[PDB]
């Protein structure tokens, strides 16, 4: 089997600046003819893969001339002259010379935006869920950058640990932002034992960490 190696795995690029991804194969991809059986693929967040460059250096239908491919044998390079916001996704190189066909590890292209502080929101548990013996309080961070953020749960100024989980979206194709939700889940007995529930957000776009809170017993 031919081993396809991509480098790098992550590529932060400011919009308007060039990007370059390399792809190395453990065997020459040149057939007896003059075609290099290497393809480049782009997978945008939430979509199926989309073909960019085929046979090493030929631009596919619909692909802007900003995308270009080069190389021959065992070394190929994909270049984007000026990256745009819509270029978010993972780029793969695949070989179609000999079976089995193999893809690269994939290069996640991050779009380097301007800093945007998150909008923090706090959601108390619903009365319907409280009837089931469990309580879920959710903390929402809306459209920030960079992805780095610290979300801590404090119940009566007591830092919680082990009862929260985070979920982050892919970089948005329009504003290059992330969204994050953190859910703190307690039983109905433990939830009713305390009063003040708060999530504290720490982010570089915030001068000091921001806290959204609520007191149970309020509608």
């Amino acid at each position: 089997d031919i081993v396809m190696t991509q480098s790098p795995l992550s590529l932060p690029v400011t919009p308007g600046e060039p990007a370059s991804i390399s792809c190395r194969s453990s065997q020459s991809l040149l057939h007896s003819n003059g075609y290099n059986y290497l393809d480049w693929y782009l997978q945008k967040p939430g979509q199926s893969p989309q073909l960019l460059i085929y046979l090493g250096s030929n631009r596919a239908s619909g692909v802007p001339d900003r995308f270009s491919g080069s190389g021959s044998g065992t070394d190929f390079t994909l270049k984007i002259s000026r990256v745009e916001a819509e270029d978010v996704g993972v780029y793969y190189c695949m070989q179609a010379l000999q079976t089995p066909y193999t893809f690269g590890q994939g290069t996640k292209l991050e779009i380097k935006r301007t800093v945007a502080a998150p909008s923090v929101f706090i959601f108390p548990p619903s009365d319907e869920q409280l009837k089931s013996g469990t309580a879920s309080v959710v903390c929402l961070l809306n459209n920030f950058y960079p992805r780095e953020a610290k979300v801590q749960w404090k119940v009566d100024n007591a830092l919680q640990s082990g009862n929260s989980q985070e979920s982050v979206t892919e970089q948005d194709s329009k504003d290059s932002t992330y969204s994050l939700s953190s859910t703190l889940t307690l039983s109905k007995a433990d939830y009713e034992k305390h009063k003040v529930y708060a999530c504290e957000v720490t982010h570089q776009g915030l001068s000091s960490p921001v806290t959204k809170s609520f007191n149970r017993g309020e509608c």
Binding site: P49, A60, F103, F123, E128, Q129, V138, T169, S179, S181
Partner: protein, 216 residues
């Protein structure tokens, strides 16, 4: 217009079998089709290929001897028989033409993908709880889809009419072995009672569909 619609996905026990059915329309029997899978959060992995000229099929080493790719030209359908399934086979499976080089233009057609999950867990329908907006503690609201298996669930807002500012998060595997996600939508703060927000949760594996009105 070329459209590839994959089918057959769902839950299967370790060592069980599934049969994926990839259908097409427009411009099929003349091109080599392929299967590409992707484990959740991992990269793409080529599975098998069948050639237009009858049966000249190749398989990856990871699926060789266990999966069988075939095609029914009489029904315009591509099939993938998956036998002796293991947990590492959990992935979204795509049927794709890969490169089609006709005339002097290169095209590519992929399907929407179908999720195959390999586990002994039982199917469970989700509970939907409202996340209502408030203040004094831009405005946000959403729905909490909790305690379901297996993936996926689909969540829309106002029967798909409301799409701006909606964020549906990736599902998270809870400690109970059940998934959980929330779908929130941010709205301008001054439109309290200006619109009505309903979330449409659909969990096809359990045949459950919930429409939850969210209001303060």
């Amino acid at each position: 217009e070329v459209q590839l619609l994959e089918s057959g996905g769902g839950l299967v026990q370790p060592g069980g079998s599934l049969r994926l059915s990839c259908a097409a329309s427009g411009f099929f029997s003349s091109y080599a089709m392929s299967w590409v899978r992707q484990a959740p959060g991992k990269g793409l992995e080529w599975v098998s290929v069948i050639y237009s000229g009858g049966s000249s099929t190749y398989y990856a080493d990871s699926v060789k001897g266990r999966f069988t790719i075939s095609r029914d030209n009489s029904k315009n359908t591509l099939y993938l028989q998956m036998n002796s399934l293991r947990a590492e086979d959990t992935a979204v499976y795509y049927c794709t033409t890969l490169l089609i080089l006709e005339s002097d233009v290169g095209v590519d057609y992929w399907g929407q993908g179908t999720l195959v999950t390999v586990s002994s867990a039982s199917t469970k329908g989700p509970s939907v709880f409202p996340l209502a907006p408030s203040s004094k503690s831009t405005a946000a609201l959403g729905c909490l889809v909790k305690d379901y298996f297996p993936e996926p669930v689909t969540v829309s807002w106002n029967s798909g009419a409301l799409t701006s500012g909606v964020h549906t998060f990736p599902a998270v595997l809870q400690s109970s072995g059940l998934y959980s996600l929330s779908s929130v939508v941010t709205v301008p703060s001054s439109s309290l009672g200006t619109q009505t927000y309903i979330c449409n949760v659909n969990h096809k594996p359990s045949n459950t569909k919930v429409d939850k009105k969210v209001e303060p």
